[PDB]
Symmetry: C2
Amino acid sequence: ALTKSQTDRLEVLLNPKDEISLNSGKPFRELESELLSRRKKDLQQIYAEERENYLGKLEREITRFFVDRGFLEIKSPILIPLEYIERMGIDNDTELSKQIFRVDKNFCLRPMLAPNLYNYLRKLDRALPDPIKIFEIGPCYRKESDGKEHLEEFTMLGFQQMGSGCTRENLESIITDFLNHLGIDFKIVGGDTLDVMHGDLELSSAGVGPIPLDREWGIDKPWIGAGFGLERLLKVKHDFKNIKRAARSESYYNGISTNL
Amino acid sequence: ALTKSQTDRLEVLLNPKDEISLNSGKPFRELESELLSRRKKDLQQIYAEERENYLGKLEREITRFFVDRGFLEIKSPILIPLEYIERMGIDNDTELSKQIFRVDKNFCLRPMLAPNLYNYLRKLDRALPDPIKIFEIGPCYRKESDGKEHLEEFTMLGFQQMGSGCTRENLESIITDFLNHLGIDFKIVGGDTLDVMHGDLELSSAGVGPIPLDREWGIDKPWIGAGFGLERLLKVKHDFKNIKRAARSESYYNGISTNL
Ligand SMILES: Nc1ncnc2c1ncn2[C@@H]1O[C@H](COP(=O)(O)OP(=O)(O)NP(=O)(O)O)[C@@H](O)[C@H]1O
Ligand SMILES: Nc1ncnc2c1ncn2[C@@H]1O[C@H](COP(=O)(O)OP(=O)(O)NP(=O)(O)O)[C@@H](O)[C@H]1O
Ligand SMILES: N[C@@H](Cc1csc2ccccc12)C(=O)O
Ligand SMILES: N[C@@H](Cc1csc2ccccc12)C(=O)O
Ligand SMILES: [Mg+2]
Ligand SMILES: [Mg+2]
Ligand SMILES: [Mg+2]
Ligand SMILES: [Mg+2]
């Protein structure tokens, strides 16, 4: 009989597509040797053939998808003024206030893309024709309780369109085309707001403006937008049991354990 | 005569390829109106035609270049244990110790890619055939004095090869092919170490191992590697006078002022 410690070890080495039962009559040492051999070969095949990281490749695919639909690619600061958090309406009553990684007296690791995207919408409205369509992909940071669906360091896609065409129907069409393009199953459930669910897992929250918060950011036009976690998309696509297999990590490469 | 404040404002709106003299007999208001019109049209052309961010696009081009040469694409944590810094031999005597953005009691924003790349080399050596070639592109953080060549939030390329073929000649060949591919002029000047210079500007530091530090990271094979700042490459390629035009920013998009 395997110990729970031994089964923990085998589960680290187990890939979703593996056809192995750890409840068999096989000794730990030889189940482990089998899985070690398979994972080494998996890494060898990646190194020989494609060599691209899941998170980088997904960012590049998403980037191509939004650029092709007319959205401008933004890369804004990850280290942001703490003031931006308060100006988003996040006060101690809100959950997110206690999730902030503070850095100095006045700065934090951004937990969200909305402040920077607001600032870009306001500035670009002076230069670009209506409608203004922008997106960003990059690191975001939140303190979280241990969870199979949460990372403290994750990667967010945020997109926003401002001006004409900012209907709920158009927002749902973007989301739907996007997830059908990636091959990810979803249901949309719904200051209009909606969530994009995969079972009980939240892939995205989306919104339709105007909302009263817009005025603090110098925004006075309708808008639609949404934010998606890349690691949650990878977790669904590859059927990972824990989102740590999709994270920036020293412990996993493309969902394969690096502790061999 | 223009005030220095007025010339500061015009210089924000001035692009390197602009054929305008601020030392002319033209009034500020109409020099400003001219440059505002040009910068709005520049942004309009980006939005109409390509829509890609300089920093994202450069990362993707570099990524294609190293993947095609057989390097595995790594995406490792940006928030790293503070311990990694000490284990790199960075003590109070070294300059970098006081440049660290600390986050909690035990974590920091990585100022460098070497710790994570060391850990990947050690782990992948159990699985991959000799030689082991890896690279990473992503955010790094250092506290710096105000400078035309330094950002506190920048983007690093780091690559490393371990095992056979780890000669200085091979390292110089990679660097040379890489910068000739990007169209960036350079001179290589030289525990063997060398710097890749563009005039007085350091594009890269590179190294040849083994070095004694390797043992602390579980490394006991020869290696070659280098690190490059992406914003410095953009600054050179686009002839920006200040590296802030190439940064993750709310103030510049592809080197164009967003304050129009
Ligand atoms: N800690 C996290 N780890 C991974 N992805 C995350 C995390 N927090 C948010 N995301 C993703 O970012 C999207 C937009 O953020 P947001 O709507 O603020 O999330 P949220 O409401 O806190 N979701 P949740 O914490 O799961 O109830 C989410 O739908 C997730 O896909
Ligand atoms: N603050 C920074 N802003 C932008 N790029 C940077 C910064 N620090 C380092 N880099 C880049 O990263 C490369 C490798 O880092 P490193 O060799 O540690 O730099 P460095 O020795 O501190 N260079 P410098 O500070 O200019 O004398 C450098 O050659 C630069 O291209
Ligand atoms: N609130 C999260 C997700 C998000 C980015 S743009 C955006 C627009 C509408 C809804 C959500 C988002 C965030 O601010 O990152
Ligand atoms: N020291 C910097 C640059 C770098 C990355 S891998 C590497 C290998 C050799 C020399 C430099 C580097 C760093 O650690 O990021
Ligand atoms: Mg949450
Ligand atoms: Mg949500
Ligand atoms: Mg320095
Ligand atoms: Mg150096």
